[PDB]
Write an enzyme that holds these catalytic residues in place. Structure first.
Site, short mmCIF file in Angstrom:
data_model
loop_
_atom_site.label_atom_id
_atom_site.label_comp_id
_atom_site.label_asym_id
_atom_site.label_seq_id
_atom_site.Cartn_x
_atom_site.Cartn_y
_atom_site.Cartn_z
N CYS A 193 0.82 -1.20 0.00
CA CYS A 193 0.00 0.00 0.00
C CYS A 193 0.87 1.26 0.00
CB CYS A 193 -0.98 0.02 1.19
SG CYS A 193 -0.51 -0.88 2.67
N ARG B 288 1.94 3.95 12.45
CA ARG B 288 0.49 3.95 12.39
C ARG B 288 -0.09 5.17 13.10
NH1 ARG B 288 -1.13 -1.10 10.69
NH2 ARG B 288 -1.79 -0.02 8.78
N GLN C 190 0.59 5.98 8.50
CA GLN C 190 -0.41 5.04 7.98
C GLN C 190 -1.79 4.99 8.63
OE1 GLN C 190 1.65 1.19 7.22
NE2 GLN C 190 3.42 2.50 6.75
N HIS D 230 -2.91 7.28 3.56
CA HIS D 230 -1.56 6.95 4.00
C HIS D 230 -0.73 8.16 3.59
CE1 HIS D 230 -2.10 3.01 5.40
NE2 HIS D 230 -1.30 2.33 4.61
#
Lengths: 357, 356
Positions: B135, B256, B162, B263
């Protein structure tokens, strides 16, 4: 006892400084005098078990009477009072949190656990102006001290995850407020297990773009987002001044605002000046100071310790995710966390005052 | 029309792929076949307006009957069915979202706006396996394509922000939920204009350590925090997608953050020569219509280079472009992009269009 004057002790940074001081019985060895622009004369805070009244923070005479001045009032104040005092001959000590004087040649950026020798030297060389540095540079040095203290850094690349406390109490409330706007707007669906996330996410995505989201202080929403902009950007000058380096150590990158309350987290890519084993680097970092807590590169511990939730409100400035990058073993990576209101703001002041007391 | 089979079209990524397809009338030029372990035989959806029934996801006979298979089911499925089909001689096209096959020598990591030539080539060379990539790598390439496409990158240093969608619907729900506990806890306090922010933050911080917060999926709280660990950067995939002649180092740290779908990434790209910023902007915005270049100005940056702005769109903006203090050979950039689209489904949707 020396007569110490406090300005902006009501403000957030001020509040943390007072609390901290009360905690370490800082007021014991000094004579505290409290200033304020509002109620000059009214009851004095009585933190040092003192009994007094509020002095005019804009009365030069009352200020000249002090031996030391600790401001958390800001550059607007500093930029007005400071020169009026110095130009009037006042030779007392000035401990500031505002950046205004950081780059003055007769001023020293304070961070004793890192540059105590530079402080003591300047102290002996007649320096009466000590200023705290960048909230990011500070925390970075507190964590990576051992590396700089061993002349092992060539340059630093950084990406930051900055908290709202960096903006102010208002910013911190906004964040928390938007946090309630998103949840409520989808409270029901979240309650029902049988719901479509994309439908859940489409609602919040929309709201976020509606305008019903309070963004006065931030300008744009922060909860469930971020802002790659913070109103020498990175502190190259301050970093080099605090360390009183011999050569210039490049310090650049990108600063980003994230949805945190007090902790400032940073991701680094340090170009070592010499291939140093990681264990050695672990030792070097761990020793330098008792706050640069080294977190091993393990999943569990990292999730437990290297996070704002873990650091917030503490004096710990942990370093983790240490390992050599693919671009060569001369490249090191590290992720640090640290409370912005403490080591990033007040702590350095509180300790400078202790030294002069 | 070819016979295309869809697996895991019900999950998050599937539901985005279907919707996107419906949007672009992708079902019109194909024969949609739906599978669903859960209810074989039952009535299927009417996306392409076609009347059909749900098939058995693990029915190799039913799968062999297809010309193309588009899975969003995951590596568990892929790792079981794929070899059973290939070893059985099935020579149909396999479009996967799962990473399992990304590194197979007879498979190609798809991202046409970036490596269309690599796809066309392999298509001609008998490659019947196409998988979506990381991703992050995906989004990075979609944004910095122009730089790689001009052989201007030496290596890339990255720090990521993210989203929860990267973990799953459960995660995205766990985050929002979390933001609920935090607010509630100090809801009254936040209501009083005369409240001590340090008292408010005291509560929040203690609750965050009370264990009262539901952190099943994340393990640790995320709302009002972050996690410097993802359950690595994608150097291999990056180099494979670009079919590079020399290994271009791609390293950093993945973190994260409390976002739902987007993202975001901060880069420090070391270039091979001193290329002016205006040039850089030209090459980047030129590569593709999704690499939206945001000038290095305060206002626009806050209005366009943020998850809130990108979420749900096919835009993959690049901003904060300027030379770092370590040299004119050093460039910095900050990118944003929806993880569910270009980071997941979009590449599949388009690969299917090519083979249709």
């Amino acid at each position: 006892m020396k007569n110490v004057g406090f300005i902006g002790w009501r403000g957030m940074v001020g509040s943390v400084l007072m609390q901290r001081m009360v905690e370490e019985r800082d007021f014991d060895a000094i004579r505290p005098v409290f200033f304020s622009t509002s109620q000059l004369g009214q009851a004095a805070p009585s933190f040092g078990g003192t009994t007094g009244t509020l002095q005019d923070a804009f009365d030069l005479e009352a200020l000249k009477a002090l031996d030391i001045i600790v401001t958390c009032q800001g550059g607007d104040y500093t930029n007005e009072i400071y020169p009026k005092l110095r130009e009037s001959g006042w030779q007392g000590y000035w401990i500031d949190a505002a950046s205004s004087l950081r780059m003055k040649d007769d001023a020293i950026i304070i961070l004793d656990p890192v540059n105590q020798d530079v402080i003591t030297d300047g102290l002996n060389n007649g320096i009466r102006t000590f200023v705290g540095g960048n909230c990011t540079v500070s925390l970075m040095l507190m964590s990576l001290g051992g590396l700089f203290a061993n002349d092992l850094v060539d340059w630093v690349s950084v990406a930051t995850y900055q908290a709202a406390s960096g903006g102010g109490a208002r910013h911190m409330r906004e964040l928390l407020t938007q946090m309630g706007h998103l949840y409520g707007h989808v409270a029901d669906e979240l309650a029902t297990p049988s719901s479509a996330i994309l439908d859940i996410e489409r609602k919040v995505t929309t709201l976020t773009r509606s305008g019903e989201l309070p963004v006065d202080n931030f300008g744009v929403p922060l909860a469930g987002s971020l802002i790659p902009w913070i109103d020498e950007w990175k502190g190259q000058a301050e970093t080099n001044k605090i360390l009183n380096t011999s050569s210039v150590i490049p310090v650049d990158g990108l600063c980003v605002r994230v949805g945190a309350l007090r902790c400032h987290s940073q991701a680094f890519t340090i170009k070592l000046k010499k291939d140093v084993s990681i264990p050695t680097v672990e030792e070097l970092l761990a020793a330098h100071n008792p706050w640069a807590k080294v977190v091993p590169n393990d999943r569990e511990i990292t999730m437990r310790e290297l996070t704002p939730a873990a650091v917030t409100g503490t004096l710990t400035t942990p370093v983790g995710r240490l390992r050599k990058l693919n671009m060569g073993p001369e490249f090191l990576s590290a992720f640090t966390v640290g409370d912005q209101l403490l080591w990033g703001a007040a702590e350095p002041l509180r300790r400078m005052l202790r030294q002069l007391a």
